[PDB]
Amino acid sequence: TATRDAGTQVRL
Amino acid sequence: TATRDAGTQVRL
Amino acid sequence: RKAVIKNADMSEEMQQDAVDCATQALEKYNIEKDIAAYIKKEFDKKYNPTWHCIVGRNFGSYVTHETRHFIYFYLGQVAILLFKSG
Amino acid sequence: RKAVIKNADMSEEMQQDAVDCATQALEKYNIEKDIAAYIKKEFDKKYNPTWHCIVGRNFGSYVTHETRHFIYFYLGQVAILLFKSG
């Protein structure tokens, strides 16, 4: 039930 | 706590 | 740009809040991740966790969302998927 | 194509299962939504709900995931985000 916030990005 | 499954698509 | 709401399971007021929030995000950020993070964090704060946001010019998705907490709309050049799960 | 794992919080065996699953999805489907739905439904069944999958050539995201249940990888021409929340 522990979580993390995470971002992704497609980059050129 | 009720849910639905949903799909999205970018179309040309 | 005016938002084009493509699919929603969400109250009219929350839909308008989503569009208003994304409009501010698009003024501030050009990177899709930053736009997404701005929207996700605002909705966590206003409407309780847990929200997830995808912003992109070309993607498909398949997700599970809490009833009445899903919106998928176009704004400017990006499609924005915003929904609550967990 | 060999997967390029860009960011993971996930066991090695589950990462390999994600790649194997997406490989079958890419053989079967060319529409990103279908690829995503195939992967999401397989992971719900094998690893319990609730999974979410985004497949795309151009997108950013900001999500919240359960610890050890996140992977973001490239396979062929698409980026695939797969994670568990709720």
Curated annotation (Swiss-Prot), chains A, B:
Role, per record: Acts via the piwi-interacting RNA (piRNA) pathway which mediates the repression of transposable elements during meiosis by forming complexes composed of piRNAs and piwi proteins and governs the methylation and subsequent repression of transposons. Required for transcriptional silencing of transposons targeted by piwi and confers its effects by interacting with nascent RNA transcripts. Likely to be recruited to nascent transcripts cotranscriptionally by piwi and to recruit additional factors involved in transcriptional silencing.
Shown stretch of the complete protein: 468 to 479 of 541
Comment block on domains: N-terminal region is necessary and sufficient to enforce silencing of an artificial reporter gene.
Remaining remarks: The name 'panoramix' derives from the mentor who empowers the French comic book character Asterix to perform his feats of strength.
Tissue specificity note: Expressed in female gonads (at protein level).
Protein encoded by which gene: Panx
Subcellular locations according to the entry: Nucleus
Species per Swiss-Prot/TrEMBL record: Drosophila melanogaster
Name this protein carries in UniProt: Protein panoramix
Subunit structure: In the ovaries, part of a complex composed of at least Panx, nxf2, piwi and Nxt1. The complex is knowns as Panx-induced cotranscriptional silencing (PICTS) complex, Panx-nxf2-dependent TAP/p15 silencing (Pandas complex), SFiNX (silencing factor interacting nuclear export variant) or piwi-Panx-nxf2-p15 (PPNP) complex. Interacts (via NIR region) with nxf2 (via TAP-C domain); the interaction is direct.
From Swiss-Prot, chains C, D:
Disulfide bonds: none
Annotated keywords: Cytoplasm, Cytoskeleton, Dynein, Microtubule, Motor protein, Transport
Subcellular localization(s) per the UniProt record: Cytoplasm, Cytoskeleton
InterPro entries per UniProt: DLC_sf, Dynein_light_1/2_CS, Dynein_light_chain_typ-1/2
Tissue expression pattern: Ubiquitous.
Keyword Lyase: no
Domain of life: Eukaryota
SMART domains noted in UniProt: Dynein_light
Gene Ontology cellular-component annotations: centriole; cytoplasm; cytoplasmic dynein complex; cytosol; dynein complex; microtubule; nucleus; protein-containing complex
Single Gene Ontology BP annotation: positive regulation of neuron remodeling
Consequence of gene disruption: Flies exhibit defects in bristle and wing development.
GO molecular function: disordered domain specific binding; dynein intermediate chain binding; dynein light intermediate chain binding; protein homodimerization activity; transcription corepressor activity
SUPFAM superfamilies listed in its UniProt record: DLC
Subunit structure: Interacts with spn-F. Forms ternary complexes with spn-F and IKKepsilon.
Family: Belongs to the dynein light chain family.
Entry function: Acts as a non-catalytic accessory component of a dynein complex.
Protein's name in the database: Dynein light chain 1, cytoplasmic
Naturally occurring in which organism (per UniProt): Drosophila melanogaster (Fruit fly)
